[PDB]
PDB file of C-alpha atoms and ligand atoms in Angstrom:
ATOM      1  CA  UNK A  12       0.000   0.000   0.000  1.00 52.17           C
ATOM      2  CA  UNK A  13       0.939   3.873  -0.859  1.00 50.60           C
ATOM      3  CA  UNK A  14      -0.037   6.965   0.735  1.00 50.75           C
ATOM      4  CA  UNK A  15      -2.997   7.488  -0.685  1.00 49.23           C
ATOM      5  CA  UNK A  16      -4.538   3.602  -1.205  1.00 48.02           C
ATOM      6  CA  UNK A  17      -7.890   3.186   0.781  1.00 49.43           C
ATOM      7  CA  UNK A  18      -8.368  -0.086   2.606  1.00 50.98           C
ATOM      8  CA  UNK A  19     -11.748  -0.815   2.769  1.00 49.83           C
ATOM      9  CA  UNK A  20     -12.570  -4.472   4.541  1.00 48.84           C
ATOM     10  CA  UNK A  21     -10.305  -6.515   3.450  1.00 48.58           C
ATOM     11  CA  UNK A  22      -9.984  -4.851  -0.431  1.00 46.35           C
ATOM     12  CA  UNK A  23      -8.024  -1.795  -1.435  1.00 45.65           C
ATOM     13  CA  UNK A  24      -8.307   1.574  -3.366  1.00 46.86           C
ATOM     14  CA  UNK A  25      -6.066   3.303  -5.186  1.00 46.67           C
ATOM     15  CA  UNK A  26      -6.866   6.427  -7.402  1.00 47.11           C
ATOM     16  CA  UNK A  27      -4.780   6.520 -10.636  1.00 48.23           C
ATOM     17  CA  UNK A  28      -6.524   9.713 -12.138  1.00 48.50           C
ATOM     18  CA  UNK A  29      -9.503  12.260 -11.119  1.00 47.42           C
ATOM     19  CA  UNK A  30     -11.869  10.009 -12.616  1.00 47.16           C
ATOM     20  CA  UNK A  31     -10.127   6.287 -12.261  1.00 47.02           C
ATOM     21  CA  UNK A  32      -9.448   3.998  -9.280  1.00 47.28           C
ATOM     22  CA  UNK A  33      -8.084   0.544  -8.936  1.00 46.92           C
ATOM     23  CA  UNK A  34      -9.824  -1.804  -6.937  1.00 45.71           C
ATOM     24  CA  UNK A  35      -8.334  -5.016  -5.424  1.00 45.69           C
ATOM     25  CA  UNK A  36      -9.475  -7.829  -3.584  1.00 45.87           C
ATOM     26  CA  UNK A  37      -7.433 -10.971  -2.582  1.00 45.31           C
ATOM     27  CA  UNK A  38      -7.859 -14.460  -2.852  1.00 41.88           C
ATOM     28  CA  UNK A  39      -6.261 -16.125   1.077  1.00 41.86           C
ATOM     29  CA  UNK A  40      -4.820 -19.787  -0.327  1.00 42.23           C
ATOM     30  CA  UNK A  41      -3.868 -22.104   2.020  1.00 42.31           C
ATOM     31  CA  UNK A  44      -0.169 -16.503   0.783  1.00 42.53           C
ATOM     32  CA  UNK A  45      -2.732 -13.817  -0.677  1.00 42.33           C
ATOM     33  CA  UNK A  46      -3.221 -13.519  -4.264  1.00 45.16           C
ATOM     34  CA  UNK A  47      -4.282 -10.253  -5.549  1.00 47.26           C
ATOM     35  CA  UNK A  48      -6.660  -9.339  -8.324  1.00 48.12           C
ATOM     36  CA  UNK A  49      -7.270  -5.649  -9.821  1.00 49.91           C
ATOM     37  CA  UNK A  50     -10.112  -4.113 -11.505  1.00 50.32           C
ATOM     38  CA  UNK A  51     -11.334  -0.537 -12.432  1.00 51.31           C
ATOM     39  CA  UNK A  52     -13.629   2.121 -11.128  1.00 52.65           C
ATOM     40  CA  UNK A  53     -14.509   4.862 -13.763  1.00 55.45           C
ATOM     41  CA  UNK A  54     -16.542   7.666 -13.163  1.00 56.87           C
ATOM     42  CA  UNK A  55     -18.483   9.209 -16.292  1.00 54.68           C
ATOM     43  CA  UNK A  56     -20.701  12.556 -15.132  1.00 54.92           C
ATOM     44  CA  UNK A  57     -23.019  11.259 -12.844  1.00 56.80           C
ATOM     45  CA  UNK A  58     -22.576   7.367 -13.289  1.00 56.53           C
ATOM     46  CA  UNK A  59     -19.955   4.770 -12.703  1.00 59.54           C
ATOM     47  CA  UNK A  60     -18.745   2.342 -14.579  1.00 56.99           C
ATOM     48  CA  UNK A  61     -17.008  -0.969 -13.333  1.00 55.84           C
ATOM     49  CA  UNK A  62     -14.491  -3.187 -14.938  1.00 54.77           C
ATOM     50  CA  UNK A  63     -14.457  -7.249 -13.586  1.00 57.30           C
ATOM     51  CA  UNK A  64     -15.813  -8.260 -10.224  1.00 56.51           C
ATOM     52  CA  UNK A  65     -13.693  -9.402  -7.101  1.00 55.95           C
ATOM     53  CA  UNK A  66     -12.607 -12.882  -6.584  1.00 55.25           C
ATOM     54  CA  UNK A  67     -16.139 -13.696  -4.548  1.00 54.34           C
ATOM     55  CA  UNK A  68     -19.961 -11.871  -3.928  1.00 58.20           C
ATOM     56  CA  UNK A  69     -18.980 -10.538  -1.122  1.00 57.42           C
ATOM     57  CA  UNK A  70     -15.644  -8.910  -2.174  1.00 56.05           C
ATOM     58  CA  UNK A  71     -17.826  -7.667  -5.213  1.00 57.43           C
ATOM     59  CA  UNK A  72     -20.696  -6.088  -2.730  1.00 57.45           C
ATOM     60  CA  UNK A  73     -17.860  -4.349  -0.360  1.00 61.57           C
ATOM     61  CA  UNK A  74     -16.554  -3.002  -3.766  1.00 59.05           C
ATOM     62  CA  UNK A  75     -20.625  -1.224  -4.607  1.00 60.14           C
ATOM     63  CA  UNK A  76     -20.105  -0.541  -1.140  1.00 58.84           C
ATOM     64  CA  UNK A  77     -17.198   1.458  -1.276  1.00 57.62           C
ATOM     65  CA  UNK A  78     -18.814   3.616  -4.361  1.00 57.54           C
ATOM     66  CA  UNK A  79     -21.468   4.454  -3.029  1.00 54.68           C
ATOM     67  CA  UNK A  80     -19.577   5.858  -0.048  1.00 54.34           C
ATOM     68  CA  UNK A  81     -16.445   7.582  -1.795  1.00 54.31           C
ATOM     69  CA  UNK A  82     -18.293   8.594  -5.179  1.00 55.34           C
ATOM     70  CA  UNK A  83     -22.005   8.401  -4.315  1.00 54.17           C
ATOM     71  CA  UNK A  84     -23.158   7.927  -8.062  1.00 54.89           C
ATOM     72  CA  UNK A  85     -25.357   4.900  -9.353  1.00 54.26           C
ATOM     73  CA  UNK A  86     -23.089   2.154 -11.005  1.00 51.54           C
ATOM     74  CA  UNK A  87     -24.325   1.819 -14.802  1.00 52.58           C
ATOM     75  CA  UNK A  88     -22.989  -0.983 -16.280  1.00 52.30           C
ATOM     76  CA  UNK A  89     -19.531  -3.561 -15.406  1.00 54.26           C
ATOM     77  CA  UNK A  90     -17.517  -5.039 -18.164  1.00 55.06           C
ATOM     78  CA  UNK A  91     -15.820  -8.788 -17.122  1.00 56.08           C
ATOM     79  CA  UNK A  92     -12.840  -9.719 -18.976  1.00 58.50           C
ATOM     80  CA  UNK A  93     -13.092 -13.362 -18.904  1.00 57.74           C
ATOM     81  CA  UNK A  94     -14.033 -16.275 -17.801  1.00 55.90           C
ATOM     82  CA  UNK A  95     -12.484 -16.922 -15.057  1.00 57.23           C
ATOM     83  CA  UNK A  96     -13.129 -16.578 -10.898  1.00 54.18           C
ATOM     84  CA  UNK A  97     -10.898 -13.482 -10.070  1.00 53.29           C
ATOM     85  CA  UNK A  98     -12.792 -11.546 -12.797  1.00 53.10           C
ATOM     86  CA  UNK A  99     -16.333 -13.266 -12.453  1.00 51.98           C
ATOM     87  CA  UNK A 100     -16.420 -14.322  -9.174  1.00 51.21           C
ATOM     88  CA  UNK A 101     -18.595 -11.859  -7.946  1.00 51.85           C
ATOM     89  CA  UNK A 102     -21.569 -11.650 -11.251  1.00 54.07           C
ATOM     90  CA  UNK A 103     -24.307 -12.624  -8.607  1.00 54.73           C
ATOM     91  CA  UNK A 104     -23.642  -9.248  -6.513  1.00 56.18           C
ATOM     92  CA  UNK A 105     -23.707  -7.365  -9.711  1.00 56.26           C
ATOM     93  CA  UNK A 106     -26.268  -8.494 -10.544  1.00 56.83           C
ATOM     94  CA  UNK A 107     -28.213  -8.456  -7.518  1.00 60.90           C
ATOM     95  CA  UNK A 108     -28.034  -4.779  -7.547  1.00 61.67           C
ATOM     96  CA  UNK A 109     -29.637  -4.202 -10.608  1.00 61.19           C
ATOM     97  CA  UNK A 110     -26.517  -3.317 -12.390  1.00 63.38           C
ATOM     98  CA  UNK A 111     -26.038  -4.603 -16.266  1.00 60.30           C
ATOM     99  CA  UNK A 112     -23.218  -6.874 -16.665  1.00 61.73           C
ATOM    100  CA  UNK A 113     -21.290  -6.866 -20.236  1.00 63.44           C
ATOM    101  CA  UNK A 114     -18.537  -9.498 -21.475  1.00 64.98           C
ATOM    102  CA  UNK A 115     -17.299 -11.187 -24.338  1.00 65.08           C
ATOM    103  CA  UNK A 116     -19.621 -13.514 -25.915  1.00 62.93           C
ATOM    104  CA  UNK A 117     -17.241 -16.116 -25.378  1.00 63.30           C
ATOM    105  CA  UNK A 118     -17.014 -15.652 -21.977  1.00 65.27           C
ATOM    106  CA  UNK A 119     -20.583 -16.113 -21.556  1.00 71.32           C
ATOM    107  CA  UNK A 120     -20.458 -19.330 -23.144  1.00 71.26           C
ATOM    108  CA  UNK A 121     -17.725 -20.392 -21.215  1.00 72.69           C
ATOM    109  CA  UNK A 122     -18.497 -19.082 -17.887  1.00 73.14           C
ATOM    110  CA  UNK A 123     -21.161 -21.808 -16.989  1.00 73.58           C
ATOM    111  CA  UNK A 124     -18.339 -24.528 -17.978  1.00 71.81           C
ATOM    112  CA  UNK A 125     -16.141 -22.583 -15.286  1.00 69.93           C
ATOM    113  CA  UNK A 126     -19.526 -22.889 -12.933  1.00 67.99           C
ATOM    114  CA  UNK A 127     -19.911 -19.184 -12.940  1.00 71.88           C
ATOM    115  CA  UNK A 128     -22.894 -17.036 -14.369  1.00 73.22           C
ATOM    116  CA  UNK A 129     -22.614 -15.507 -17.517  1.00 76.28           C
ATOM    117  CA  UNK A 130     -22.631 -11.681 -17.800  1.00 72.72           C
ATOM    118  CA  UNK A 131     -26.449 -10.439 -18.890  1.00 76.03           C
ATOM    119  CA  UNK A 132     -24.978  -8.843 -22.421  1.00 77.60           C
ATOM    120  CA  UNK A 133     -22.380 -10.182 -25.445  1.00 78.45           C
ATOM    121  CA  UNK A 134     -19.954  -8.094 -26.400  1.00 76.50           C
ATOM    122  CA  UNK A 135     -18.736  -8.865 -29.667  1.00 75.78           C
ATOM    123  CA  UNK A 136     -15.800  -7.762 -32.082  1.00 74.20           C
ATOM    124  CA  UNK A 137     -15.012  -7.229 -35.399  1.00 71.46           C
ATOM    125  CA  UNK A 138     -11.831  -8.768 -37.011  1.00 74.69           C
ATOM    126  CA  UNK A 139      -9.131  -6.380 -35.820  1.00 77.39           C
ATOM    127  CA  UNK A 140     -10.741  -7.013 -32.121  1.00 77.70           C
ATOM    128  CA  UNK A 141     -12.323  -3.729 -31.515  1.00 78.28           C
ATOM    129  CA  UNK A 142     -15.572  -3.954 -30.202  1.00 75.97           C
ATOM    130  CA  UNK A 143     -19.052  -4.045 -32.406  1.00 74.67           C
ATOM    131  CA  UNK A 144     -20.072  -0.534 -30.949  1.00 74.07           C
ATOM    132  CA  UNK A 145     -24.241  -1.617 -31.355  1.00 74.09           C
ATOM    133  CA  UNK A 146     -23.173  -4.221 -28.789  1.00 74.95           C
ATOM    134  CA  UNK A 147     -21.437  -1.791 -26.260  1.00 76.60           C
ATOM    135  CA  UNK A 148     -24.125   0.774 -26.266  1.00 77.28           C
ATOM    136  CA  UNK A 149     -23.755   4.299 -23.531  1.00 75.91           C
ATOM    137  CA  UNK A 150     -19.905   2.768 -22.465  1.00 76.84           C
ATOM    138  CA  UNK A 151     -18.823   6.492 -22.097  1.00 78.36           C
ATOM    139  CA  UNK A 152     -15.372   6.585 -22.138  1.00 75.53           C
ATOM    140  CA  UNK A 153     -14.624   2.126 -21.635  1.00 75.72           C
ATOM    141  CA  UNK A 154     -12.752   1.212 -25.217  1.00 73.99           C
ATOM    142  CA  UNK A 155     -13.160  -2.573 -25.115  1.00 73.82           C
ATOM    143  CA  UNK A 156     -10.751  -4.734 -27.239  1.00 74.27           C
ATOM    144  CA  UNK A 157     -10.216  -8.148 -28.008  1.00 77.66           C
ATOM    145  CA  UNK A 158      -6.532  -8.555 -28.682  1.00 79.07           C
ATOM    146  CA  UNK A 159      -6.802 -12.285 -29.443  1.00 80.77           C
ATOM    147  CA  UNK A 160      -6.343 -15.620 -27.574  1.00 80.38           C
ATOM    148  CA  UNK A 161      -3.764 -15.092 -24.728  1.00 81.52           C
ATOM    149  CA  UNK A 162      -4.092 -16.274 -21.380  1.00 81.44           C
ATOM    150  CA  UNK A 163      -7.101 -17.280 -22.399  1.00 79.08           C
ATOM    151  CA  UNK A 164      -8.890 -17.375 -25.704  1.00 78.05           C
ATOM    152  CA  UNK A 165     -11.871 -15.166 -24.466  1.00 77.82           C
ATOM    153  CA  UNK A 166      -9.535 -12.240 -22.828  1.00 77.03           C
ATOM    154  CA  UNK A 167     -10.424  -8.487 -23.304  1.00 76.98           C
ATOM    155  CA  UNK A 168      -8.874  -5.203 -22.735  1.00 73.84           C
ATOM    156  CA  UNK A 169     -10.094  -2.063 -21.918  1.00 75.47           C
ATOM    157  CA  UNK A 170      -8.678   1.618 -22.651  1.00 74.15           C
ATOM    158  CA  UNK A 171     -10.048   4.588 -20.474  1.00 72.88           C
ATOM    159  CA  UNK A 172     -10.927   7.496 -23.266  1.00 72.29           C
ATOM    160  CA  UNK A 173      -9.144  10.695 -22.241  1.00 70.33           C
ATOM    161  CA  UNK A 174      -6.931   9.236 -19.848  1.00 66.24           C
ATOM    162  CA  UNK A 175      -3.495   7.516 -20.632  1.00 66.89           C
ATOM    163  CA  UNK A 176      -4.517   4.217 -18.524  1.00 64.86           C
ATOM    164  CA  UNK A 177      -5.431   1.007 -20.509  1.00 66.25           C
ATOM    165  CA  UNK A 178      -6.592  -2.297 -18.539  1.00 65.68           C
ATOM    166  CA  UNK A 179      -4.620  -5.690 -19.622  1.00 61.98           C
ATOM    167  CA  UNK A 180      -6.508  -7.683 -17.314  1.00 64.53           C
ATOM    168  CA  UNK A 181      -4.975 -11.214 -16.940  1.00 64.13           C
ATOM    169  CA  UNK A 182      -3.342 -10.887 -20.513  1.00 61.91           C
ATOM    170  CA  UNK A 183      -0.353  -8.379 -19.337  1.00 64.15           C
ATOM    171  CA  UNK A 184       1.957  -8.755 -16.559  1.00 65.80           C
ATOM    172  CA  UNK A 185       4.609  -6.627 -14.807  1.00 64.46           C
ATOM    173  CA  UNK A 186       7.640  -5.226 -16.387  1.00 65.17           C
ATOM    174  CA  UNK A 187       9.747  -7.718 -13.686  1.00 67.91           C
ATOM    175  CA  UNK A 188       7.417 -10.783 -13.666  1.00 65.99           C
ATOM    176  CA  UNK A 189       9.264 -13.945 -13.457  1.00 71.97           C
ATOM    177  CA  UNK A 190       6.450 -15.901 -15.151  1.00 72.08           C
ATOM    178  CA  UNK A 191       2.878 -15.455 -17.299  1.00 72.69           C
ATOM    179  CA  UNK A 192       0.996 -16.375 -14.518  1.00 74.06           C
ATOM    180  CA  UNK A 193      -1.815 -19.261 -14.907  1.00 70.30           C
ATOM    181  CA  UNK A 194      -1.792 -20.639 -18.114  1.00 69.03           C
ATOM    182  CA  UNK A 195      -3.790 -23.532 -16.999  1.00 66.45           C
ATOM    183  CA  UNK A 196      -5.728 -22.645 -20.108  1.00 66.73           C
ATOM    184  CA  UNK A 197      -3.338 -20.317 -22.554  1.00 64.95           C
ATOM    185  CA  UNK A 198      -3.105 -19.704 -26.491  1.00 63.89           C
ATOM    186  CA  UNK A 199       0.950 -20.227 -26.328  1.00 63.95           C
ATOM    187  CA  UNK A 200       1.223 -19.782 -29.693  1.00 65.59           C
ATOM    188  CA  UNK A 201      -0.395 -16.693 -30.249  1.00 63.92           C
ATOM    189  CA  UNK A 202       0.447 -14.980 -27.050  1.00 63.31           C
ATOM    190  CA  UNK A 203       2.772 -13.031 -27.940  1.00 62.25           C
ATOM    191  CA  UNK A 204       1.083 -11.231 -30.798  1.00 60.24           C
ATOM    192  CA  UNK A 205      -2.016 -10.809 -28.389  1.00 59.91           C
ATOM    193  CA  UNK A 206       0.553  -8.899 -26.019  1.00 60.90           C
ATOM    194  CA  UNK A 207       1.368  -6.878 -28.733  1.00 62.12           C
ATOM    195  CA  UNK A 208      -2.239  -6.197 -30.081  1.00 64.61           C
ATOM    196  CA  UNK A 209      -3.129  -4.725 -27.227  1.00 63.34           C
ATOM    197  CA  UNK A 210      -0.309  -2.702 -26.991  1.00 64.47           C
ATOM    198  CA  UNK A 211      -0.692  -1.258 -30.932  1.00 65.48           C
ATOM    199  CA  UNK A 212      -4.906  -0.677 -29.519  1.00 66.05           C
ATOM    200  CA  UNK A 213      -3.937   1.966 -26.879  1.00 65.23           C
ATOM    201  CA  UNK A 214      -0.466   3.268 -27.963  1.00 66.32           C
ATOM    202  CA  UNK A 215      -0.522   6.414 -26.244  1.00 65.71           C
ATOM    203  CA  UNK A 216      -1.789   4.582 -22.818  1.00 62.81           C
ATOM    204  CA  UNK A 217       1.402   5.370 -20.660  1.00 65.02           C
ATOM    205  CA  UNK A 218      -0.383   3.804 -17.223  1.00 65.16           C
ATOM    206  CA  UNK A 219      -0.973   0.198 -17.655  1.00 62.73           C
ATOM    207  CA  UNK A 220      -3.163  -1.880 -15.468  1.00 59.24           C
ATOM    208  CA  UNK A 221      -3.282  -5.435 -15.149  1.00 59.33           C
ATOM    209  CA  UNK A 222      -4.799  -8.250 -13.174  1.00 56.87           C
ATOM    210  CA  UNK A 223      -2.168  -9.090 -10.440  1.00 57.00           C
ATOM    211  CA  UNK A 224       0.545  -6.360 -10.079  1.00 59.49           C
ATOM    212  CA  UNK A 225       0.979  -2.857  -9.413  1.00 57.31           C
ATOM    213  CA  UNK A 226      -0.162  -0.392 -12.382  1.00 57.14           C
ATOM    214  CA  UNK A 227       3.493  -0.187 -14.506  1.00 59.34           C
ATOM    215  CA  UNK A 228       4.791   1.080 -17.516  1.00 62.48           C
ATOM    216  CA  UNK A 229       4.578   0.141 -21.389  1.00 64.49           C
ATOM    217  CA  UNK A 230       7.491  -2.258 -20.092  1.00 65.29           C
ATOM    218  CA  UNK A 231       4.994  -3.986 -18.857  1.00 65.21           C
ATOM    219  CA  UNK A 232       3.749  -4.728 -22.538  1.00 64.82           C
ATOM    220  CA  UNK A 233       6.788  -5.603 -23.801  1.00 67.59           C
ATOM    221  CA  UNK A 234       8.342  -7.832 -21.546  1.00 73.64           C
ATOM    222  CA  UNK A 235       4.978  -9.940 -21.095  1.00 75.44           C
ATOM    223  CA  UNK A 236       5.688  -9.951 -25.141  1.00 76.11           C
ATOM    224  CA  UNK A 237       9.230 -10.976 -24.980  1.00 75.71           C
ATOM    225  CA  UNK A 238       8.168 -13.974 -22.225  1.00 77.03           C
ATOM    226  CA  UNK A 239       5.337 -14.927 -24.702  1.00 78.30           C
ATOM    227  CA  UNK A 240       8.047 -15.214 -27.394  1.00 80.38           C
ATOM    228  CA  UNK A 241       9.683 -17.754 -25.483  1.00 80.66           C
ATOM    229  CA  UNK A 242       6.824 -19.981 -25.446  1.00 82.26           C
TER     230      UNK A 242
HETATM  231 CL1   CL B 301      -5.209  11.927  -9.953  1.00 81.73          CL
HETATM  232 CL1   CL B 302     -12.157  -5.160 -38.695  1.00 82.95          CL
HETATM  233 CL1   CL B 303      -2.689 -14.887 -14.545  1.00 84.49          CL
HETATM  234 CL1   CL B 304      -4.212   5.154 -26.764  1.00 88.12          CL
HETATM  235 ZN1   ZN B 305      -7.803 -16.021 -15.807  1.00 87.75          ZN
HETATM  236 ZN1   ZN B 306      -5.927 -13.616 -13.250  1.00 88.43          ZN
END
């Protein structure tokens, strides 16, 4: 934690611009495994990207925007199929809020015994979303960079901001390892990596799933690891 970070329960806020916070909530195995995901603020609405690993990680994080922003949560965006970014649909959904993800996902999720997101996102052939299918996201640029950690993975760029959102797809500029990829694309990895990077090229804040916000580095050496694969 930095001066600045909020701990709220047992997650943690951190503002990265006037109108964009990182949320994170931790998984206890039996050390703590961190996942992060995105608070926007658009005028008088909010806008959410992935859950917390569980319902009640997902409720404390509505609970904590109500109480720091006070503004009604429009719509969350889940970036795939998977428990840290998913985990918490039914709270989501229990507050009335409209849930987006990949279409894919939402096949997939009830394999992964999870709910599927209420809307399908879908993407055109350079992986850019089909806007008809992401209508009112303000400023949330979704984008499919193709099959990487998993084959359903999105990204998400905050419009007039430099901060794009690499979800489980990106890791740190000094990660040791890709993380899970209990159910990877190896081969096209790397080029995913890079997709997303080419999608947002002026993003100079880059958020991802289990580390710190970090540089373009981050990018490139998750690129350069994918290589090697
Ligand atoms: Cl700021
Ligand atoms: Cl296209
Ligand atoms: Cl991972
Ligand atoms: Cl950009
Ligand atoms: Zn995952
Ligand atoms: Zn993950």
């Amino acid at each position: 934690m930095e001066t600045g970070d909020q701990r709220f329960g047992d997650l943690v806020f951190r503002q990265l611009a006037p109108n964009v916070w990182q949320h994170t909530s931790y998984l206890d195995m039996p050390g703590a495994v961190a996942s992060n995901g995105l608070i926007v603020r658009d005028g008088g609405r909010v806008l959410v990207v992935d859950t917390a690993w569980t319902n009640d990680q997902t409720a404390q994080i509505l609970n904590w925007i109500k109480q720091e922003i006070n503004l009604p949560v429009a719509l969350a965006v889940v970036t795939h199929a998977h428990q840290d970014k998913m985990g918490g649909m039914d709270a989501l959904h229990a507050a009335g809020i409209a849930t987006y993800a990949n279409a894919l996902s939402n096949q997939l999720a009830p394999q992964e015994g999870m709910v599927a997101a209420q809307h399908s996102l879908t993407f055109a052939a350079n992986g850019w979303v089909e806007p008809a299918t992401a209508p009112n996201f303000g400023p949330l640029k979704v984008f499919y960079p193709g099959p990487g950690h998993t084959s359903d993975n999105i990204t998400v760029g905050i419009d007039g901001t430099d901060i794009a959102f690499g979800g489980c797809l990106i890791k740190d500029s000094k990660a040791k390892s890709l993380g899970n990829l209990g159910d990877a694309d190896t081969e096209h990895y790397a080029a995913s990596a890079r997709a997303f990077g080419a999608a947002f090229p002026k993003a100079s804040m880059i958020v991802m799933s289990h580390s710190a916000p970090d540089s373009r580095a981050a990018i490139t050496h998750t690129a350069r690891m994918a290589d090697k694969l």
